[PDB]
Amino acid sequence: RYTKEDILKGEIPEHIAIIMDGNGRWAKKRSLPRIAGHHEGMKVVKRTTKLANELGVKVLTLYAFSKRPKMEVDFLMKLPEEFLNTYLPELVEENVQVRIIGDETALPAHTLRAIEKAVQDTAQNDGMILNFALNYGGRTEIVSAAKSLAEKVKEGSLNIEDIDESLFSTYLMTESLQDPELLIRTSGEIRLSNFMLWQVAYSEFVFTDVLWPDFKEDHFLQALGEFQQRGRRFGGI
């Protein structure tokens, strides 16, 4: 419905967050193994990155889910390395900054050292930020912020009366990131699932039935079109 051209003439949210869901359901629909769903979603991460960056998006936060059989768990823990293997050279050429939020202690040393090198390899780029949220949880992030504030208060380098909304935001894992103007959730679930609770206080939400491996350029455009037409509504605010 919405061509690319139409979308560009309109407003482009600086920070988009996508809850990438439905990789396994896609595989089942396809009569394919579950791991083939996750691999296909990996290629969709690339196309989304490219288009969002072409579109002038400034931050793209992609959320990958967390008790499946431990062959599948190990496989997903190796996806970052495969993705970075195949797509990092064009990520540095396309001027992307690779970044990661979440509990990093949940991944093996080898996976972290691959991730951390792609990070420092793109840190001197200044284009789009590609933020991967891994083993990330909204409530845990909030509680960890409170505990670190409590510890500075305990040590006497922070006074409780100086703890305010903006200071609290500096203690979250997204401290140097503007809040997402747009959150997209694929695979038909209409929930937040413990994702960026504090940060999406005022974000527009766009839900779609489309499964993440199917969520290609046209579907991405339609969500932007949905975002834009909300800005063109009349009446009260």
Ligand X SMILES: CCc1cc(N2CCCCCC2)n2ncc(-c3ccc(F)cc3)c2n1
Active site residues: 21
Q: Is 20 in the site for ligand X (CB under 6 A)?
A: yes
**Is 25 within any annotated ligand binding site?**
yes
Helices (H), the chain: 4-9, 23-29, 34-54, 70-93, 109-122, 138-155, 165-170, 217-231
- Give the Cα separation of 189 and 183 in Å (integer): 13
Q: Is 153 in the site for a second copy (CB under 8 A)?
A: yes
Helices (H) and strands (E) in the chain, counts: 8, 6
Q: Which of residues 218-237 bind a second copy (CB under 8 A)?
A: 230, 235-236
CB-side neighbour CA atoms (13 Å) of 47:
15
**Is 24 within any annotated ligand binding site?**
yes
Q: Is 30 in the site for a second copy (CB under 8 A)?
A: no
Q: At its nearest, how many Å lie between a second copy and the CB of residue 98?
A: 27
Q: Which one, 149 or 211, has the nearer CB to ligand X?
A: 211
Instruction: Let me know: does 18 contact 186? Beta carbons within 8 Å.
Output: yes
Q: How many residues does the chain have?
A: 237
> Which region, judged by CB under 6 A, interacts with ligand X, from 1-9, 39-47, 186-194, 219-227?
39-47
Q: At its nearest, how many Å lie between a second copy and the CB of residue 110?
A: 29
Size of site (CB under 8 A) for a second copy: 39
- What are the residues whose beta carbons fall under 8 Å from the beta carbon of 92, sequence distance 6 or more? 121, 122, 125
Binding footprint of ligand X on the chain (CB under 6 A): 20, 23, 38, 41-42, 45, 64, 76, 79-80, 83-84, 98, 100, 115, 118, 132, 134, 212
Known binding residues for substrate: 22-26, 34, 38, 66, 68, 185, 191-193
